[PDB]
Amino acid sequence: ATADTSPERLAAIAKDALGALNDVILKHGVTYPEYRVFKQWLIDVGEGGEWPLFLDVFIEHSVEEVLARSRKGTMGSIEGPYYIENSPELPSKCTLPMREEDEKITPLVFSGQVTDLDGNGLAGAKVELWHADNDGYYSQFAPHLPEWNLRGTIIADEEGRYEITTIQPAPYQIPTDGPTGQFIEAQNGHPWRPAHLHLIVSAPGKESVTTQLYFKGGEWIDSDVASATKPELILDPKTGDDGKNYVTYNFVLDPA
Amino acid sequence: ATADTSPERLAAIAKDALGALNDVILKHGVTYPEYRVFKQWLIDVGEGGEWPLFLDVFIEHSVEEVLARSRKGTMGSIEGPYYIENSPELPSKCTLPMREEDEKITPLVFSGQVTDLDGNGLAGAKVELWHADNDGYYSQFAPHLPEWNLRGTIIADEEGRYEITTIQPAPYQIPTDGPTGQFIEAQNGHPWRPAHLHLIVSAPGKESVTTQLYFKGGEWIDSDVASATKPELILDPKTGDDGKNYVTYNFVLDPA
Ligand SMILES: Oc1cccc(Cl)c1O
Ligand SMILES: Oc1cccc(Cl)c1O
Numbered sequence: 001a002t003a004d005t006s007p008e009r010l011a012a013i014a015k016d017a018l019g020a021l022n023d024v025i026l027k028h029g030v031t032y033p034e035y036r037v038f039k040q041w042l043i044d045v046g047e048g049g050e051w052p053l054f055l056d057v058f059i060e061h062s063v064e065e066v067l068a069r070s071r072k073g074t075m076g077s078i079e080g081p082y083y084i085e086n087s088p089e090l091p092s093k094c095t096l097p098m099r100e101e102d103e104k105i106t107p108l109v110f111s112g113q114v115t116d117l118d119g120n121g122l123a124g125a126k127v128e129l130w131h132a133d134n135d136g137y138y139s140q141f142a143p144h145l146p147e148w149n150l151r152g153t154i155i156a157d158e159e160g161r162y163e164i165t166t167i168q169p170a171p172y173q174i175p176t177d178g179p180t181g182q183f184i185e186a187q188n189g190h191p192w193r194p195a196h197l198h199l200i201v202s203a204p205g206k207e208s209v210t211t212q213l214y215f216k217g218g219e220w221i222d223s224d225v226a227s228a229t230k231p232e233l234i235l236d237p238k239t240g241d242d243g244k245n246y247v248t249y250n251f252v253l254d255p256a
Numbered sequence: 257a258t259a260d261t262s263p264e265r266l267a268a269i270a271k272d273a274l275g276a277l278n279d280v281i282l283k284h285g286v287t288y289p290e291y292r293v294f295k296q297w298l299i300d301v302g303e304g305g306e307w308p309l310f311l312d313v314f315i316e317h318s319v320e321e322v323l324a325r326s327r328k329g330t331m332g333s334i335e336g337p338y339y340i341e342n343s344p345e346l347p348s349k350c351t352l353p354m355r356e357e358d359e360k361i362t363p364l365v366f367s368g369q370v371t372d373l374d375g376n377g378l379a380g381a382k383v384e385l386w387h388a389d390n391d392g393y394y395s396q397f398a399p400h401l402p403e404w405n406l407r408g409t410i411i412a413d414e415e416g417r418y419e420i421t422t423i424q425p426a427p428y429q430i431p432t433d434g435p436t437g438q439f440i441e442a443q444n445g446h447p448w449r450p451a452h453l454h455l456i457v458s459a460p461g462k463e464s465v466t467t468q469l470y471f472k473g474g475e476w477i478d479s480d481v482a483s484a485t486k487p488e489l490i491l492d493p494k495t496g497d498d499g500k501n502y503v504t505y506n507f508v509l510d511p512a
């Protein structure tokens with residue numbers, strides 16, 4: 001992993017990042033017992049392997065807020081720690097891989113079209129979906145699950161449309177008996193995320209979008225610990241007489 | 257290590273610390289290639305065990321600047337990563353433990369008195385000295401050195417005076433082929449400290465002081481990478497006709 005940044009830019013970055021922190025210590029009168037605790041917690045983050053967690057919850061929102069200024073298409077959001085590459089491909093209309101345990105849960109049917117800025121249909125266009133199960137587990141992040149459970153690469157047809165069936169997600173709680181959750185708990189916070197789909201959407205000759213979609217009445221909707229939920233990405237699914245929840249949603253892709 | 261801080265205070269602390277950083281990302285337009293690099297570097301700091309180094313160089317100065325508001329005695333400074341407790345005791349006038357390799361170097365003779373705010377003499381009063389050798393190594397931080405090389409606990413007499421002989425320190429360069437030094441080097445900085453004595457000074461019924469002393473014409477004197485050098489802590493040693501450098505310095509101790 002490399003940035004291709006200059007020493008001039010880094011220097012300016014670190015000066016005000018360090019200036020900022022050093023400024024919070026002065027402003028609040030941070031003591032020496034406090035400093036020791038802090039240092040000890042940074043070691044633990046590393047030792048608990050919680051660096052992508054902590055940063056993704058607490059920092060990635062600004063990185064996407066920056067990228068967000070540059071694009072005219074669908075609203076993006078943070079990737080989070082759990083994306084996996086080359087998930088198995090599925091046809092234009094499909095079901096997401098899932099176990100019998102998953103078959104017990106109210107289904108979600110997710111339809112729409114991948115278009116360009118003008119609104120034209122895009123063939124040979126892909127939707128990478130992934131999200132958590134009713135337990136708040138992600139596959140490849142819990143040994144009891146099959147390695148592509150609720151992950152897939154959806155191949156959109158002739159005109160960019162896709163119809164995808166999966167389950168309807170339940171609120172993810174981030175891990176707590178570790179440094180990130182001890183961080184939240186010592187400040188009387190809450191370790192909850194909204195229920196969400198993660199998606200990378202692409203198509204030839206387009207700047208991909210990475211985003212999330214959420215659910216209209218959901219808990220933790222206006223208190224996302226990751227600060228990653230927007231108005232523009234909240235679905236409002238209607239239920240069929242089959243009893244399955246139904247949503248349509250379209251992705252608008254910028255020029256690459 | 258425990259602070260005894262409330263959730264209210266921590267919450268306020270983390271809000272503006274996180275707000276601050278998130279504010280630097282927005283201000284500079286930090287990209288996604290940049291973010292990956294950053295995250296990867298935080299893992300390495302941990303994995304290189306460079307957390308007390310990085311923080312002590314870049315952060316501890318504000319913690320002491322805070323404590324500095326509360327005290328009327330000698331000017332303090334940052335401890336740094338290398339203090340060791342219960343170094344062996346020596347009488348009021350002594351020499352610091354050192355090898356034959358150390359005996360080759362111009363000697364430093366360091367005299368003075370530990371007093372109170374009014375200026376009265378303090379018996380049963382201690383000076384913990386430690387510092388680096390002409391190589392820029394600290395004992396217990398390089399396997400080739402004897403475990404108390406240039407460390408000791410000096411026992412001041414009847415009236416708080418001490419006379420201590422050691423070597424005259426050479427400029428410490430912090431480690432470079434690791435994350436902290438790759439941090440400095442990618443921004444065209446310099447990994448140099450001034451030459452310095454570390455000292456903890458105490459006496460019964462007094463708030464100890466932790467500080468450093470530096471040398472009047474030294475290199476890196478106005479570009480200390482740790483930002484830890486003050487005007488008030490720069491010695492000006494005269495050389496004897498024995499050829500040994502001579503300094504007197506007195507420590508003024510606040511009520512505990
Ligand atoms: O499931 C998650 C866990 C932690 C952070 C984010 Cl952004 C997630 O989506
Ligand atoms: O020797 C040192 C190395 C790193 C930081 C400080 Cl403050 C030192 O004194």
Ligand SMILES: [Fe+3]
Pocket residue numbers: 080082131132172196198
């Ligand atoms: Fe998630």
Ligand SMILES: [Fe+3]
Pocket residue numbers: 336338387388428452454
């Ligand atoms: Fe030092």
